[PDB]
Amino acid sequence: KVFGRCELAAAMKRHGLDNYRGYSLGNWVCAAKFESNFNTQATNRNTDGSTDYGILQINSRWWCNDGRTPGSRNLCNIPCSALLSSDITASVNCAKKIVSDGNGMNAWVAWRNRCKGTDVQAWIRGCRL
Template identity: 35%
Template sequence: MSRLLLVWVALTLIDSSQQHARVFNRCQLSRELLRYNFPRAQIANWVCLIEHASGRTTDKVTNHNNAYTSFGLFQINNKEWCKKGKRGGHCNMKCEDLLNEDLNDDVRCAKRIYDRVGFKNWPASFAYCKDKSLPDLSKC
């Protein structure tokens, strides 16, 4: 009986330590952004940026050639905005906290970035969206 209990505890610990990711479709993502009070007029821009940055996936990690890494749905980097393994950066958060389904901290940081530098923080991704045809969200 105690062996069964040990197995159950081990499996529970393993399961609770894993990151839970979410992949959004366009409509789900646009609804989430509206729920977090992103300006309606910018939703298509944000959806486009997120599609090109992370593929609408919350657990995306991108290692860059410049020794920095981008994390999560918004691909927020550890150069300025978060720190690996500990709270820090301009968003005062651990980068790993950007890799789960809970978008509260991701949104808070993305909005802080946008308020400071606009879409310039995401130059490669936003290049796909600026002055181009944005995602059609009319069916959402």
């Protein structure tokens, strides 16, 4: 599923992402924009053999099991495929764990490089929230 901008903001707020660990809704939406362009089915293979999955491109090295990332962990205790569902519950649950890991949303390199320190409010602007 390819979410619209405000549709995702609504879903993310519903699932309790609005200011989770101090991060405003606009941050999470911006992160999704540049990670997956709002597409739940996005995948991207890393050079280390790991793979990123879903709206927030959560990686198989630490967070999910895809059964093809030698020596990796599954800290979110889910199949990586669950992160590709049109229902973003698994992605949100897992993301809450990642951002609580110590380095905040810096865990998402696209967030740090493209969202961090920007007017993130713009991403939820005009939306009925």
